[PDB]
């Protein structure tokens, strides 16, 4: 194990590992800043849409208390779906989403107005979830290098370096003995 | 093209059926978990769910968090929220940034 | 330098069956005796296990094996916590750490200069380990019955504190240790409800 | 540890009429699968189970079952060579057939479950 | 210990002209012959390359240089992957690793105990290396044409299996190797469209 | 750095008649609180300030004053053992009395400011 | 490998009258861009092509061409110093004028293609 070829190679792995640690740490920081912008937008969006949705819901429940027979009929008969396009925010794959009675009538226009903001919430909230996961995956790679890989390289280099010197002294000690023979 | 699903109590999420959303009305941890799993299996793009139903299946929702689709979006009922959606946002800030940035 | 690869330690381990490796990091952490429970070994463990099972008429060897399995799993889990943080572990893994924690500081850690903790009888040792292992056993079942890790810890503050004091229970009052088992079963079942 | 272990006289002592015709092929495929699976495990334990490709995740599980069920048998367990070879096939069946490149089609069709 | 810095190997390398460095790591994963392609060298490579170019009437020298260059590139990529992961690797780098993998497993690895694989003629060697490089070249073009690495790999399972088993094709049937070049180009173009 | 530092014979030079009766208890408590304080500080470094509980924040602040006011005294300042012990009680008062588990109630009632 | 290679008397045999006036400046510039380009290649492997700027992708391409066309000349190719200096400028021409910092605009306007 402790040869000079191993020493030079492990010293090279340390330099690379040190640089990789710095690059990954910078990446995590860059992802964090972009996340900060997105997560604030996520917060504001959610707070607003939560108030609007519940209000639209409370207006519909006040309309219900006609009969459950008629309300069931109206809620039977356009089909809306969504397209999901992928885009990259730095290194992260992220979705882009777009859509494809009297008192009980006004409430319908209430839910219909929610939809654009409800889809926007889905898009932004998912984006932040995906950004957060990338931050954590970057963090694990940083911690692997910082707390495992680099210290193991440092300690092994120090050890081999010491062992090489010990053997060199034992070798000259033998030569001095052989000399006197 | 992806479908949209909704999970919550009848009185709250019924009008979503007007737009052709898969509106389900689960009330127990078992049935709500089944619906989300099948919806995910059927390649739904977004799944909206009331916080009262989401409060019963936190481990199911957490499984799809790092997935592109479906996006499991917590919404209120006509009673309100449990503050879970805003707590999840708040929590992600704490572990990504390290301090309250909101 | 504490490096056991040197000739004296190596030649000794060639002919002895028991290795108590002392640890400097444990000594700094006030963990005494400072025996590294991951690196240490005894090649008499299996034979002693048979002797103990016979003399105690209990499944002692299984308890010792389970206790070491938990400590070994703790070492694996601690590497994950170092990388991702403790909040990333499941409830089952969070429980394993707490049980390992109980083993470490309620059982392994022993004060030589404390009048009661300085010596632990064979009978007392059995009762202490049994109680520690029972908590983990009952808590494990609670998790599979729908209880959450946080709920289990919050509702078992009093009994866990009692487990951690069992090392100081006098040798003539060992009934106070064994009775912790029932208290564990009671409180946890109540938490499930 | 089968990876740094070796036998230099295995070729002429194995095969048809000695053990079974699938002996050498399965030995090579098991070695290759184990070395790759052991590598994947060690990566997953440090960088996460989600850091492995879809196929390496299969190899990681193989190396685990290999150590726990194949290598680990007990100091008082005496397996016939047929039992050993058949068990080897059960583990290789965990991998996609396309990954079994050390084994010819004639052996795969005959023994692979 | 495999340490080539010892006096016998070192003094020998000063007077011989070809170095076939055997590797323990290759031997353990049953990669035979276990010749380290990064450590090894031949001072006759350039002259032999000239001879082969003339014999084959092909750019054999270039193919060998390109083969070794891919292997050297894989080595540099692996230095990062080991201490970072395959997470951030581009499609081009992933293609490089696949081509190098093909060079290692489909070309370098050779079973002395197989009746056909035990010996490979110059022409069969040329055709096998040609095929391997051709896949890399065609896949490379497809990437620049907007195709994804994942798509290229999934659509070329059958043809890459033919490459993997080229080593077993009889010397009298070398047309079964050379024809692969046309399957590579046809299949990959279909993926582009 | 008091964490890796140790005196093995310290018991033979402390306590009533030698220093003061509260010597050993406060020492055990100060060392324990400082180790927990440093642990909380390192946690804030790697995971952020929001990773600490309200108690962890108190211990972290304790470790700061311990270093800045207690350990740090200057190279030309002589502190009597009485001054050292009194200063130790000032830092311990930061922590909730319920957290001073290494000190019995008789010593807490008498000395705690 | 030009990075660890060194000539300690190089400044004594170069310049106007000896080689050409753009000798020292282009040497420092080629050295800087080569080391920077190698760093860029490494960055692409560590963080992906996502992390590369447009300037970064050029330096990476510079280092590639530098090894393959400048350093790799062949064992039977005899380049005059003029041809060598001119090839240096053709490689430096890959970079924006903003990046050519170690070269005074005086000689940059005279030689840059």
Length in residues, chain D: 113
Write out chain C residues lying below 8 Å of D48, CB-based.
84
Nearest Cα of chain E lies from the Cα of G26 at a distance, in angstroms, of 29
What's the full length of chain B, in residues? Answer: 102
CB B12 within 8 A of CB A57: yes
Q: Solved how?
A: X-ray
Beta bridge partners of E19: E41
d(CA E157, CA D99): 11
Pairing of strands A92-99, B22-24: unpaired
Q: Name which of E136, E169, E165 is nearest E153 in CA terms.
A: E136
Inter-chain contact G48–E90, Cβ cutoff 8 Å?
A: yes
CA distance A159 to chain D (A): 24
List chains adjacent to chain G, taking adjacency as at least 3 C-beta pairs closer than 8 Å: A, E
Fold of C43-193: 1.10.1140
CA distances from B34 to C94, E45, G85 (A): 27, 65, 72
What tokens does B46 get?
């977004």
Distance CA B76, CA B85 (A): 9
Q: Which residue has the tokens 């929590």?
A: B91
Breaks (C-N over 2.5 A) in chain B follow: none
List, as own/partner pairs, every contact residues F69-78 make where C-beta atoms lie below 8 angstroms and the sequence separation is at least 24, other chains included: F70/F30, F71/F2
Report yes or no: E9 and E43 within 8 Å, Cβ to Cβ: no
Residues on chain G touching A24 (C-beta within 8 angstroms): 46-47
Q: Helix (H, G, I), strand (E, B), or coil: what is residue A75? A: coil
Beta-carbon separation of C83 and A136 below 8 A: no
Do the beta carbons of residue G28 and residue G92 sit within 8 Å?
Answer: no
Q: Chains contacting B with at least 3 CB pairs below 8 Å?
A: A, F
- Chain F meets chain G (3+ C-beta pairs below 8 A): no
What span, in angstroms and rounded, lies between the C-alpha atoms of F109 and F25? 13
- DSSP for G36-84 reads HHHHHHHHHHHH-TTS--HHHHHHHHHHHHIIIIII---TT----HHHH
Which residues of F, range 52-91, sit inside 8 Å of C by Cβ? none
Burial of C55 (0-12, 13-18, 19+ CB in 10 A): exposed
Residue D112 exposed, middle or buried by CB count within 10 Å (0-12, 13-18, 19+): middle
Q: From CA E110, how far away is CA E166, in angstroms rounded?
A: 11
**Partner-chain contact D51 E87, CB within 8 Å:** yes
Which residues from D are below 8 Å from C83, CB to CB?
Answer: 46
> In what helix (H) or strand (E) does residue A119 lie, and over which residues does it extend?
helix A108-144
Which H, E and C letters describe chain C, residue by residue? CCCCCCHHHHHHHCCCCEECCECHHHHHCCCCCCECCCCCEECCHHHHHHHHHHHHCCCHHHHHHHHHHHHHHHHHHHHHHHHHCHHHCCHHHHHHHHHHHHHHHHHHCCCCCCCCCCCCCHHHHHHHHHHHHHHHHHHHHHHHCCCCHHHHHHCCHHHHHHHCCHHHCCHHHCHHHHCHHHHHHHHHHHHHC
3-state secondary structure of A63: helix
* Closest residue to A75, CB basis, from B17, B78, B97: B17
User: What CA–CA distance (Å, rounded) separates D73 from D87?
Assistant: 12
Question: Residue E127, class by beta-carbon neighbours within 10 Å (0-12 exposed, 13-18 middle, 19+ buried)?
Answer: buried
CA distance G22 to G111: 8
D14: left (phi over 0), alpha (psi -120 to 50) or beta: beta
- Select from E36, E83, E86, E87 the residue whose CB has the most chain A CBs within 10 Å, as the one to mutate to test that interface: E83
Give yes or no for a contact between C34 and C26, defined as CB atoms under 8 angstroms apart: yes
* A17–E3 C-beta distance less than 8 A: no
In three-state form (DSSP H/G/I as H, E/B as E, the rest C), the secondary structure along chain E is: CCCCCCHHHHHHHCCCCEECCECHHHHHCCCCCCECCCCCEECCHHHHHHHHHHHHCCCHHHHHHHHHHHHHHHHHHHHHHHCCCCCCCCHHHHHHHHHHHHHHHHHHCCCCCCCCCCCCCHHHHHHHHHHHHHHHHHHHHHHHCCCCHHHHHHCCHHHHHHHHCHHHCCHHHCHHHHCHHHHHHHHHHHHHC
Output the six-digit token pair for G59. 């330096």
Which residues in chain F are closer than 8 Å to B99, comparing Cβ atoms?
48-50
Contacts of C83 in chain A (CB under 8 A): 140, 143-144, 147
Helices (H), B1-102: 10-13, 29-41, 51-54, 58-63, 84-96
Pick the residue from chain D with its C-alpha nearest to E113. D11
HEC letters along chain F: CCCCCCCCCHHHHCCCCCCCCCHHHHHHHHHHHHHHHHHHHHHHHHHCHHHCCHHHHHHHHHHHHHHHHHHCCCCCCCCCHHHHHHHHHHHHCCCCHHHCCCCCHHHHHHHCC
Tell me which DSSP letter residue B90 carries. H
Secondary structure (DSSP) of D3-37 = TT---TT-STTSSTTTS-TTHHHHHHHHHHHHHHH
- Calculate how close chain C gets to F35, using CA atoms only, in Å: 9
Note whether A155 contacts C: Cβ–Cβ < 8 A. Answer: no
Determine contact, residues A37/B101, Cβ cutoff 8 Å: no
DSSP B17: G
Contact between chains at A140 and C84 (C-beta distance less than 8 A): yes
Q: Does the beta-carbon distance from G48 to A24 stay under 8 Å?
A: no
DSSP one-letter code for B5: E
Q: B7: helix, coil or strand?
A: strand
- The answer to whether E and C touch (≥3 CB pairs < 8 Å) is no
Distance from the B87 Cα atom to the nearest Cα atom in chain F, whole angstroms: 14
- C-chain residues near F3 (CB < 8 A): 28
Q: How far apart are CA D36 and CA E101, in angstroms?
A: 13
Provide the number of CB pairs (under 8 Å) joining chain A to chain G.
19
Q: How many CB atoms lie within 10 A of CB C157?
A: 10
E83, E76 in Cβ contact below 8 A?
no
Q: Length of chain C in residues, anyone?
A: 193
Strand partners, F17: none
Contact A91, A134 (CB under 8 A): yes
What's the CATH number where B18 sits? 3.40.50.10580
Q: Which residue of A has its CA nearest to E4?
A: A5
Resolution, Å (one decimal)? 2.2
Phi-psi region of C97 (alpha: psi -120 to 50; beta: other; left: phi over 0): alpha
- Is the CB of G46 less than 8 angstroms away from the CB of A88? no
Using a CB-CB cut-off of 8 Å, the residues of chain D touching C79 are 45
Strand partners, E41: E19
Closest CA to E174 of E120, E134, E135: E120
Do residues F93 and F71 touch, judged by C-beta distance below 8 A? Answer: no
Euclidean distance between CA atoms G59 and G55, whole angstroms: 7
Smallest CA–CA separation between C193 and chain A, in Å? Answer: 33
Containing structural domain, residue A86: 1-180
Residue B76 three-state SS: coil
Give me the number of domains chain B comprises. 1
Cis check for the bond before B70: say yes or no (omega within 30 of 0): yes
Residue of chain E with shortest Cα separation from A10: E79
Q: How far away is chain E from the Cα of G45, in angstroms, using its nearest Cα?
A: 6
Q: Provide the number of CB pairs (under 8 Å) joining chain A to chain D.
A: 9
Domain of residue B3 covers 1-102
Task: Tell me the CB-side half-sphere exposure of residue E132, using CA atoms within 13 A.
Answer: 30
Q: Could you tell me if D59 and D36 are in contact, meaning their C-beta atoms sit under 8 angstroms apart?
A: yes
Cα(C38)–Cα(C21) distance, rounded to whole angstroms? Answer: 9
Quick check: E1 contacting D, CB < 8 Å?
A: no
Cβ of C28 within 8 Å of Cβ of F3? The answer is yes
Q: How many domains does chain A have?
A: 1
Tokens 């978990």: give the residue: B33
Substitution target from C83, C85, C89, C93 for chain D, most D beta carbons within 10 A = C83
CA–CA gap between residue B14 and residue B25 (Å, rounded): 9
């Amino acid at each position: 194990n402790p040869t000079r070829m191993e020493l030079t190679r492990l010293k090279k792995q340390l330099t690379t590992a040190t640089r990789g640690h710095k690059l990954l740490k910078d990446k995590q920081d860059e992802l964090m800043r972009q996340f900060i912008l997105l997560i604030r937008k996520n917060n504001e969006l959610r707070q607003a849409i939560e108030k609007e949705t519940q209000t639209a819901m409370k207006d519909f429940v006040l309309a219900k208390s006609v009969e459950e027979a008629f309300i069931d009929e109206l809620l039977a008969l356009e089909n809306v779906s969504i397209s999901v396009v992928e885009k990259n925010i730095m290194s992260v794959k992220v979705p882009l989403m777009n859509f494809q009675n009297a008192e009980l009538d006004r409430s319908i226009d209430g839910f219909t107005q929610l939809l654009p903001k409800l889809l926007k919430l889905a898009e932004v909230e998912k984006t932040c979830q995906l950004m957060a996961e990338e931050i954590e995956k970057t963090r694990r790679r940083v911690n692997a290098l910082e707390y495992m890989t680099i210290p193991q390289l440092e300690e092994t280099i120090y050890y081999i370096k010491m062992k090489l010197e010990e053997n060199e002294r034992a070798e000259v000690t033998r030569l001095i003995k052989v000399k006197n023979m | 093209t992806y479908k949209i699903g909704v999970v919550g109590d009848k009185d709250s999420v019924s009008p979503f059926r007007l737009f052709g959303f898969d509106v389900q009305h689960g009330t127990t941890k078992t049935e709500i978990r089944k619906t989300i799993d099948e919806m995910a299996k059927n390649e739904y793009g977004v799944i909206y769910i009331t916080e009262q139903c989401a409060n019963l299946v936190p481990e199911t929702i957490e499984r799809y968090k790092g997935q592109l689709t479906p996006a499991i979006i917590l919404i209120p009922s006509h009673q309100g929220t449990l503050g879970i959606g805003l707590e999840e946002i708040q929590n992600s800030v704490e572990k990504a940034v390290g301090q309250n940035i909101l | 330098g504490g490096d056991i690869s040197e000739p004296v330690t190596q030649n000794t381990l060639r002919v002895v069956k028991v290795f108590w490796g002392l640890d400097s990091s444990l000594a700094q952490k006030r963990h005494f005796p400072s025996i590294n429970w991951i690196q240490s070994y005894s090649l008499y463990s299996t034979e002693v296990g048979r002797y103990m099972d016979q003399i105690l008429q209990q499944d002692w060897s299984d308890m010792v094996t389970e206790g070491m399995r938990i400590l070994q799993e703790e070492e694996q889990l601690n590497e994950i916590v170092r990388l991702v943080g403790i909040d990333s572990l499941s409830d089952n893994d969070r429980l394993t750490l707490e049980v390992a924690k109980s083993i470490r500081e309620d059982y392994l850690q022993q004060n030589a200069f404390d009048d009661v903790d300085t010596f632990t009888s064979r009978e007392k040792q059995f009762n202490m380990l049994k109680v520690i292992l029972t908590f983990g056993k009952e808590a494990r079942k609670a998790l599979s019955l729908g209880a959450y890790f946080n709920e289990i810890m919050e509702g078992t503050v009093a009994v866990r504190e009692r487990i951690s004091r069992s090392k100081y229970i006098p040798e003539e009052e060992l009934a106070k240790i064994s009775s912790i088992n029932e208290e564990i079963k009671e409180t946890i079942q109540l938490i499930v409800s | 540890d089968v990876l740094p272990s070796l036998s230099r006289l295995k070729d002429k002592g194995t095969g048809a009429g000695k053990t079974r015709e699938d002996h050498a092929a399965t030995m090579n495929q098991l070695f290759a699968a184990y070395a790759q699976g052991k590598q994947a495990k060690e990566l997953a334990v440090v960088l996460g189970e989600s850091a492995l490709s879809d196929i390496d995740k299969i190899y990681a599980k193989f190396a685990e079952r290999f150590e726990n069920e194949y290598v680990n048998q007990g100091f008082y367990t005496n397996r016939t060579i047929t039992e050993t070879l058949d068990l080897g096939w059960e583990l290789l069946a965990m991998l996609p057939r396309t990954e079994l490149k050390r084994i010819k089609d004639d052996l795969l069709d005959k023994y692979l479950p």
